[PDB]
Homo-oligomer: A and B are copies of this chain.
Amino acid sequence: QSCLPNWIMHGKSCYLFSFSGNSWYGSKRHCSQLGAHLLKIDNSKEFEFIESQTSSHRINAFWIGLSRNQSEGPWFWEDGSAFFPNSFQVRNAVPQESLLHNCVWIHGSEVYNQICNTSSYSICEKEL
């Protein structure tokens, strides 16, 4: 069971920390070109691993595979599964301030909703 050069193994996955700026959509499509998807956080061990990387790279945020379709309405992971705050809650959460903030990125130790077209770094994930 292998990961590609420059991808990091943890748990049951391979990870690319992409230090390049893209909208959330551009990030999704970059991960897709690599046969991967934007990060889905599945458990606490996965979260703490990711967080140990994002908190050590806190100059930019990293787009992840979490988004909603309505400007407030349910968060869903890139595989279509529902969000549960098992490891973290999405931050910036009153009605008004959340307006058009429909995609999610990690910045340091915090997971934030954000305007989808914002240029940021990203994390891709592929199964080990």
Contact = CB atoms under 8 A, between A and B. Distances in A.
Interface of A: 25-32, 67-71, 74, 76, 79-82, 100, 102-103, 116
Contacts of A81: 29, 32
Contacts of A31: 80
28 contacts: A25-B74, A25-B76, A25-B80, A25-B82, A26-B80, A27-B80, A28-B76, A28-B79, A28-B80, A29-B79, A29-B80, A29-B81, A30-B80, A31-B80, A32-B79, A32-B80, A32-B81, A67-B69, A68-B69, A69-B69, A69-B102, A69-B103, A69-B116, A70-B70, A70-B71, A70-B100, A70-B102, A70-B116
Nearest to A103: B69
A26 to B, nearest CB: 7
Copies of chain A in the complex: 2
Given A25-B74, A68-B69, 7 more contacts: A25-B82, A29-B81, A30-B80, A32-B81, A70-B71, A70-B100, A70-B116
